[PDB]
């Protein structure tokens, strides 16, 4: 899983070398940034339900057809509403995981790999999820470097869907 620590090790190991100060500096940077990253992760976790609920409604407001149109890919039934809330919660859980791990690895492995295939096969619009993510970014309530951390991972997801 891609984290600053596993990237450092992987570099040293590709080269058949012991870790050098070059890598240890990298991990120190991770450890110092973890202060801001854990603050973000805890905040998003504590406020997860309201962010998920609000984000789903942001999607339905932007895209009203998703609440009415017939088909199992839409949120026009109780099951579709539940699938959508589930999926938004998945995106937000992944953001929290990236913050904890100090990199994109959790999102990359558990969500981004195969994303394009799933969206195509099941007729899910990337724009739905981009809207959810933009709501989370706007409303997470963070400031300072905790906000910068959260937004970096939210924007990474948005870029993955664009």
């Amino acid at each position: 899983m891609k984290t600053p620590i596993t990237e450092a090790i992987a570099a040293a190991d590709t080269q058949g070398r012991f870790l050098s100060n070059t890598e240890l500096q990298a991990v120190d940077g991770r450890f110092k940034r973890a202060v801001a990253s854990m603050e973000a992760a805890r905040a998003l976790t504590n406020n997860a339900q309201s962010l998920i609920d609000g984000a789903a409604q942001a999607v339905y407001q932007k895209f009203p057809y998703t609440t009415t149109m017939q088909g199992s890919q839409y949120a026009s039934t109780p099951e579709g509403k539940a699938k959508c809330a589930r999926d938004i919660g998945y995106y937000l859980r992944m953001v929290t995981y990236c913050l904890v791990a100090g990199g994109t690895g959790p999102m990359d492995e558990y969500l981004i790999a195969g994303l394009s295939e799933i969206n195509s096969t099941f007729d899910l619009s990337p724009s739905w999820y981009i809207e959810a993510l933009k709501y989370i970014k706007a409303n997470h309530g963070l400031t300072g470097q905790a906000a910068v951390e959260a937004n970096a991972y939210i924007d990474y997801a948005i870029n993955a869907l664009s």
Partner: protein
């Protein structure tokens, strides 16, 4: 591979859960203790050539059979291979120390090593003795109170011993 943070995430993900306050606290404590971990890695790496050489010289003094003609460390090609293995093992242990998790050691180094040695006829028991000697030397170097801000690294030393013990058990 996984580090200590990735391991908690992976476990969380398999349950579909956000982390708990206790899990956040545990990770925050790991970060708080990070300078000690960096010092241990730096110290051991900075001394790697002597840790290996000294453990090899001691093994062969205690186990002369290994360097008699016909012995598994006789000829320069076999001696170089043995020295290399000691360096490899120590390298992967230091990765495990940085990561705070044994996965890189298990996956990239220890898995299959017993079988490798059995096919070769290398005596894994004697390998285990070389690992133990590096363990004791590494710990003494990492935990040297001179030239460092004073504090208690005992938990970290216990963790570091663990990794060496795991390597030894995998080959013995």
């Amino acid at each position: 591979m996984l580090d200590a943070f990735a391991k908690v995430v992976a476990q969380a993900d398999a349950r579909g859960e956000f982390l708990t306050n206790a899990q956040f606290d545990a990770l925050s404590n790991l970060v708080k203790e990070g300078n000690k971990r960096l010092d241990a890695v730096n110290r051991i790496t900075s001394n790697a050539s002597t840790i290996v050489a000294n453990a090899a010289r001691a093994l062969f003094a205690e186990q002369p059979q290994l360097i008699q003609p016909g012995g598994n460390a006789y000829t320069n090609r076999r001696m170089a291979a043995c020295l290399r293995d000691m360096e490899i093992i120590l390298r992967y242990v230091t990765y495990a120390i940085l990561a705070g998790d044994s996965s890189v050691l298990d996956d990239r180094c220890l898995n299959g090593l017993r079988e490798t040695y059995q096919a070769l006829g290398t005596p894994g028991s004697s390998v285990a003795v070389a690992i133990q000697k590096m363990k004791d030397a590494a710990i003494a170097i990492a935990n040297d109170p001179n030239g460092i801000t004073p504090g208690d690294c005992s938990a970290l030393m216990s963790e570091i011993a663990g990794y060496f013990d795991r390597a030894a058990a995998a080959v013995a």
